[PDB]
Amino acid sequence: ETTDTIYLIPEEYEGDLIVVYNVPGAELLPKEEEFSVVTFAADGTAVTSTKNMKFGTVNDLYYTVNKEGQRTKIDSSCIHFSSTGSRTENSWEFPFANLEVTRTACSQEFSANGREVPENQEHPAEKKMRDLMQRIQERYMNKVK
Amino acid sequence: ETTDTIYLIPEEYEGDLIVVYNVPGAELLPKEEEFSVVTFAADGTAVTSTKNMKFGTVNDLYYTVNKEGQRTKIDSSCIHFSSTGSRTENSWEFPFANLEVTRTACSQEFSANGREVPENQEHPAEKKMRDLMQRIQERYMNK
Amino acid sequence: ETTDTIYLIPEEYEGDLIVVYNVPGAELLPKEEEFSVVTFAADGTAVTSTKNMKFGTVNDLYYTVNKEGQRTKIDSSCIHFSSTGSRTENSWEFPFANLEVTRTACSQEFSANGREVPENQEHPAEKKMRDLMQRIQERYMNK
Amino acid sequence: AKETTDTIYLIPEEYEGDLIVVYNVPGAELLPKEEEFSVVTFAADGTAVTSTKNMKFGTVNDLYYTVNKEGQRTKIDSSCIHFSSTGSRTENSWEFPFANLEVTRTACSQEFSANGREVPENQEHPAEKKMRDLMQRIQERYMNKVK
């Protein structure tokens, strides 16, 4: 068994990426063949009602997309898989994934560690996540079950 | 419902800090979990419509923030909590808080007393406050 | 014969760097000891009236600078020396230098090749240069 | 020994930070004397330039004061002062002895006295630039086309 996920990144984007699952009201991940398709918004965020991500041998594919939706494959060395987890708001669990993309510095070093960031400062993805959760709670959870 | 407070200071700022509450028209303090979030402007000032502060400094957290908003925790020795009170302009009460931050002299001395200032002279924060009240009255109290 | 040049880059900048020489009206490169000092503007551009750059064995030093001008040395692995040449506008020749800086990917690979860019498409520095020449013509060439 | 440093430093009351004294600068004023002490008066930028050949040596008995616009002095504790370094800088074949000190109003303490203010790790110390600029002002004002 494999991860079978396709990630579509806006071509002009560079940086941290976040996918949040099990978000009610959100769209489900479309399927193309055996792959689930994650489409990131211009801010590198993706929200879906799909219950969770897949676990298994990583065989994900990554592409950048222009405004018209035409895809351009990116090498794995341009992608860094940072972390996964779950966040509980109220009693509802949202699994999530943190990735990072580059156009400038594709390399094995990047794939393993992502971009170099300041020492004591929190990682920029923490803020992106912090803000994304708020957007989620406001747009999708606001006085609803 | 909150219990504690998070203070966000611009990384390049140094000196006195003032937070003024119950300012109508001002933004309310955002909430992150159980903490209220105070974001200081470049001049070390923060104005909010939140009725009042959380009574206690106990477990507050402090951070500096870059332009992009990424946070960096500050050692407690770099922060001094000075005073709280209320100021009445007309018949309207504004609760406030005075704190002080440093980058260059973090120390236990600083944490306990803030920077050393002249003896027979008003603390510089008094003028900062005096001027802040005026900016408040002009932009919010009669706009 | 050595290059003897000090490059001062704004700490927040990342990407292509361009230095253009023999620009009349522009400031001359200050001199510190045996080194010429190039100070880049926020857009990674530097314009000077110094007739030309020095040629020889590269012994340049690189630093990032905060708003106050304090320097922080950066490793050579964060810098890529791309190219040099001359560009003629009207009948006037402007020697130039193309460098590239990174914070994200300092490495020996970067030092030798700079960041990876698309194959057939023009290098992004070509546009930066194209635009810089226009700014030069407008602000300094007449005027 | 009977040899002491006998120096009085006058700092503008509003100044805080790095201090530099440069000696053996021709054309500059000589250090005035008050009793047995030499008097260093810093300019508003915390710089002092003098034609006095060198700083004094011996048992340290220096006094420090801040001064208002009217010139009235206010003694400051030694804990408000950090003596950073001394040396000599050679331009051409001319030697300029110098001294680096630092003053604070905010944080007088033993820690400060011993280490001066906390500055960023990889960055050069702010005094390096102050010195760099001061030497240039010296070369330019006191000797561009002069001997």
Q: β-strands B61-65, B4-10: how paired?
A: parallel
Q: What is the DSSP letter of A34?
A: T
Q: β-strands D63-67, D73-75: how paired?
A: antiparallel
Backbone CA torsion sign across A46, A52, A54, A55: positive
Interface residue A118 vs chain B (CB under 8 A): yes
Interface residue C34 vs chain D (CB under 8 A): no
Question: Do residues A3 and A54 make contact, with C-beta atoms less than 8 angstroms apart?
Answer: yes
C-alpha to C-alpha distance for B47 and C98, rounded to whole angstroms: 47
Question: Which of the residues C70, C74, C78, C106 would you substitute to probe the D interface, choosing the one with the greatest number of D C-beta atoms within 10 Å?
Answer: C70
Name the residue type at position B35: F
Separation in Å, CA of C100 to nearest CA in chain D: 21
Contacts of C11 in chain D (CB under 8 A): none
Contacts of B72 in chain A (CB under 8 A): 118, 120-122
Minimal-distance CA residue of chain C relative to A109:
C105
Q: Is C15 left (phi over 0), alpha (psi -120 to 50) or beta?
A: left
Contact D107 B107 (CB under 8 A): yes
C-alpha to C-alpha distance for B34 and B4, rounded to whole angstroms: 7
b vs e for C4-39, b when ≥16 Cβ sit within 10 Å of the residue's Cβ? bbbbbbbbebbebbbbbbbbeebeebeeeeebbbbb
Neighbours of C50 (CB within 10 A): 19
Neighbours of D24 (CB within 10 A): 18
Contact D123 C71 (CB under 8 A): yes
C-alpha to C-alpha distance for D98 and A130, rounded to whole angstroms: 52
- What is the experimental method? X-ray
Cβ neighbourhood burial of B42 (10 Å; 0-12, 13-18, 19+): exposed
Backbone CA torsion sign across A141, A144, B5, B7: positive
Q: Where are the domains of chain D?
A: 1-147
C-alpha to C-alpha distance for D102 and D104, rounded to whole angstroms: 7
CA distances, C33 to each of B73, C19, C100, C106, D132 (Å): 40, 21, 25, 28, 10
β-sheet bridge partners, residue B95: B86
b vs e for D114-142, b when ≥16 Cβ sit within 10 Å of the residue's Cβ? eebbbeeeebebbbebbbeebbeebeeee
Of C72, C6, C49, nearest in space to C141 by CA: C49
CA distances, B39 to each of A120, B11, B27, B64 (Å): 20, 12, 11, 10
Reported as type and span, the H/E element at residue A62 is: strand A61-65
Q: How far apart are the first and last CA of chain B?
A: 30
Contact D109 B106 (CB under 8 A): no
Interface residue D123 vs chain C (CB under 8 A): yes
Question: Do residues A79 and A54 make contact, with C-beta atoms less than 8 angstroms apart?
Answer: no
Minimal-distance CA residue of chain C relative to A78:
C116
Q: Where are the alpha helices (DSSP H) in chain D?
A: 110-115, 126-143
Cis, peptide link before residue C143, omega less than 30° from 0 = yes
CA distances, A127 to each of A124, B37, C52, C66 (Å): 6, 14, 46, 24
Contacts of A105 in chain C (CB under 8 A): 102, 104-105, 110, 115-116
Q: Locate tokens 């009240």: which residue? A: B133
Which residues have CB under 8 Å from D147's CB, separation 6+?
Answer: none
Of B124, B108, B110, nearest in space to B18 by CA: B124
Q: How many Cα atoms sit within 13 Å of A136 on the Cβ side?
A: 27
Of B115, B116, B125, B124, nearest in space to B18 by CA: B125
Question: Do residues B48 and B21 make contact, with C-beta atoms less than 8 angstroms apart?
Answer: yes
Backbone angles phi, psi at C131, to 5 degrees: -70, -40
Cβ neighbourhood burial of A25 (10 Å; 0-12, 13-18, 19+): exposed
Question: Do residues D120 and C72 make contact, with C-beta atoms less than 8 angstroms apart?
Answer: yes
Interface residue C123 vs chain D (CB under 8 A): no
Contacts of B107 in chain D (CB under 8 A): 107, 109, 111
C-alpha to C-alpha distance for A76 and A112, rounded to whole angstroms: 10
Backbone CA torsion sign across A54, A60, A61, A67: positive
Separation in Å, CA of D118 to nearest CA in chain C: 15
Contacts of C115 in chain A (CB under 8 A): 104-105
Number of CB pairs < 8 Å for A and C?
27
Cβ neighbourhood burial of A61 (10 Å; 0-12, 13-18, 19+): middle
C-alpha to C-alpha distance for A7 and A30, rounded to whole angstroms: 11
Contact B110 D112 (CB under 8 A): no
Question: Do residues D25 and D17 make contact, with C-beta atoms less than 8 angstroms apart?
Answer: no
